[PDB]
Design a protein around this nucleic acid. Structure first.
Length: 49
DNA sequence: ATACGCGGCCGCCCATCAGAATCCCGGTGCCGAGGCCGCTCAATTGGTCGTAGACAGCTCTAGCACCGCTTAAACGCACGTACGCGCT
């Protein structure tokens, strides 16, 4: 389930919703919620340490 | 009248009993992961429809290349002036 299937530490089923409610393009590409959680986690980790 | 005795005082080394101080073991407070949890409202699940957008065909602009006549602009150097910058 999202983190699982994706294999990330970030919420994949949270940024998908905001990107569709922000109202960016007409519909949303399937690519992004998942990809978009990934880089975010990556940045998150780069600072903490 | 005249000579002997001594008396506590005292420096001396020498003895006894308490207090100061270092080491052998310590309790205490603060910070940060943990656990617990629970009412719940946002994500997920299973599902339909339709429409963007991938994709293949097509044609039809414009970006490339290439050349040579013409010449304005760059080049390099020579000479000195009037600033950069150092000192006071």
């Amino acid at each position: 389930t999202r983190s699982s299937r994706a294999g990330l530490q970030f919420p994949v089923g949270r940024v998908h919703r905001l990107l569709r409610k922000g109202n960016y393009a007409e519909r949303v590409g399937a690519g992004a919620p998942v990809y978009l959680a990934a880089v975010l986690e990556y940045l998150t980790a780069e600072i903490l340490e």
